[PDB]
Amino acid sequence: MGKCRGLRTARKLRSHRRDQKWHDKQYKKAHLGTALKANPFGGASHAKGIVLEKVGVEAKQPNSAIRKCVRVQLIKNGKKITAFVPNDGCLNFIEENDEVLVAGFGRKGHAVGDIPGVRFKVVKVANVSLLALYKGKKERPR
Amino acid sequence: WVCRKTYVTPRRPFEKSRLDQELKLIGEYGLRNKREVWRVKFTLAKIRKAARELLTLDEKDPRRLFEGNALLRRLVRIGVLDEGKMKLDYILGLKIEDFLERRLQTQVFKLGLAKSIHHARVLIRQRHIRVRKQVVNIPSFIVRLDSQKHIDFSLRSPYGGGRPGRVKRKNAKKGQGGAGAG
């Protein structure tokens, strides 16, 4: 309520809504494309890179742990992304200066859990999954 | 070319109330999965949508007459509805279970020769029945009303006339090469 309800006010409605839609956060990222330019991804689900070097990443309080991530440079941008490594002992199955395949966490822009500064994780080392390396139904191909 | 789905999934993923109904319904009729249940309920809820239109259309609109007349004939022809009803209000009184009575495996058990319902499905698949002259292998035949008085066993089977199976004729050859020459 508190607004026009004319019969010839189609212009004053459809131009107002087209302006006040930009104050929404979601809409403003989709249509400016500043999302694409700023992201290390092109909007692609995955991406591929080459390892730079292992790191240890401290946890946010209350939790205290060391989380053993990696840091990676990409093939098609040359810029750098810091990527989590999953389950116990899977760090060892990643060896420095090889290729890897990365993927987002599942929150689509934001850092997940108690680990800060990480927005990406790792899925395949070299056409072989972290699962089959971990479980033992496959072996290192080298 | 042209393809479409014949079922839908429930909006809720879990719900204690729902799951028990779907389980106990599958137990009675010997169904393999919930996909065999939701299939039925898609067709039914489709028919419940079409009916829900025509009741709101003007009485003695030509669209309302021709559709309803030929619709109710089809519901009567499969035998989920009576002609002592024969109006659109009784479409909404129709429900899920009445369909399942007209399934082939249900009619084998109910009006023919079977043990438990779990047996009867196996007989349909192992080609021991026919529908009038024609072998079937599909327990989801849904059976027209006229064809209920032609459900018979098959004319080539060990059940009734026709050649025995390989369990019998094996043991017959155990009388000749298992203890007759071996």
Binding site: K68, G89, N92 | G27, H118
Partner: protein, 59 residues
């Protein structure tokens, strides 16, 4: 204690015992798995006074 640093990975998984008791018994599929599920819950017919039991209880 913790000796030989606590940054070490493979720690918990490389010092646990590994045991099994893999099945000889074949489990059912498709139709019969639902048949047993129906009978074991509803058509037994056991239930008694108000209780919390669940379908599992290794307590």
């Amino acid at each position: 204690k913790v000796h030989g640093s606590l940054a070490r990975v493979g720690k918990v998984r490389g010092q646990t015992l590994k045991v099994a008791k893999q099945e000889k018994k074949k489990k059912r599929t498709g139709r019969a798995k639902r048949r047993m599920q129906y009978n074991r819950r509803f058509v037994n017919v056991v239930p008694t006074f108000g209780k919390k039991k669940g379908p599992n209880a290794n307590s």
